[PDB]
């Protein structure tokens, strides 16, 4: 009766400690991103393997657009402009010779004539993009009636596919310009100590329960090499040779 409480307590412990490991804390490693980089306003490369970030945020002040050539340029991109499907599955802030416009995966999120953003009114271009929202919010300028020129499409399937922060600009970092993405590193975790203890305890308890069940099955009068495991046969020789030959 002393070896029947073992096979009970060490069998329930190894169950309540093993049905509770996929609920205990882990330690995730979280990566971020932020161009500029070295304060030099050049392209970089970051080929996300999940093909999409968690967040995205661009600021793009107004002086950057005011100080561009009469040609368009791409003040801020996510894939190279000449990619295979770059207009699709990417985000652009193009500043073409007639208008500024923030685009997305083949949808025009916002568009404003250039002679309006080139005015003392506009201040920056916030291009946040997260779960359930892809708005474009040109600060400064006002929609004709009363709105501050915001955009929409709250579709959560509009996050751009990121392979870099390619830009058509050269020179030192102008103040205000700031991109920021959040990479989806959710699978790269490591267990805490409160989870290693639970794993070790579950395994030790399920070993002790089996040892006690073994010691309990021997209340019959038994406990503790035949002639089959001692012979060798032509069949065994053939099978061993035909396995070793086929392995090579």
């Amino acid at each position: 009766r002393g070896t029947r409480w073992v096979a009970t307590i060490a069998g329930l412990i190894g169950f309540v400690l093993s049905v509770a490991t996929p609920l205990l804390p882990v330690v995730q490693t979280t990566a971020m991103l932020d161009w500029p980089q070295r304060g030099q306003l050049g392209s970089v490369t970051a080929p996300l393997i999940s093909l999409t970030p968690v967040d995205f945020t661009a600021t793009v002040p107004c002086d950057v657009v005011r100080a561009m050539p009469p040609a368009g340029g791409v003040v801020l991109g996510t894939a190279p402009k000449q990619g295979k499907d770059a207009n699709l599955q990417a985000l652009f802030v193009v500043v073409s010779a007639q208008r500024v416009d923030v685009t997305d995966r083949n949808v025009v999120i916002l568009s404003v004539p250039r002679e309006q953003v080139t005015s003392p009114q506009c201040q920056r271009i916030e291009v946040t993009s997260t779960h359930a929202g892809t708005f474009a919010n040109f600060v400064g300028l006002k929609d004709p009636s009363g709105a501050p020129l915001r955009s929409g499409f709250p579709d959560p399937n509009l996050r751009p596919q990121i392979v870099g922060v390619f830009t058509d600009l050269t020179g030192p970092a102008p103040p205000g310009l700031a991109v920021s993405a959040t990479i989806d590193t959710r699978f790269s975790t490591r267990p805490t100590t409160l989870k290693l203890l639970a794993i070790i305890g579950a395994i030790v308890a399920t070993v002790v329960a089996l040892i006690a069940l073994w010691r309990l099955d021997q209340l019959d009068g038994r406990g503790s090499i035949p002639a089959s495991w001692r012979t060798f046969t032509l069949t065994d020789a053939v099978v061993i040779f035909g396995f070793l030959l086929w392995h090579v």
């Binding site: 995730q28 990566a31 971020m32 970089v44 779960h131 922060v165």
Partner: peptide
């Protein structure tokens, strides 16, 4: 390569999660 662009610095850190936390769904299609 299409554009001459060097790799990026990644701004790493750590955070202790739980067994039921999730930052949202994965964008698998339109």
């Amino acid at each position: 390569t299409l554009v001459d662009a060097p790799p990026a610095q990644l701004e790493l850190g750590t955070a202790t999660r739980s067994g039921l936390w999730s930052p949202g769904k994965i964008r698998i299609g339109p």
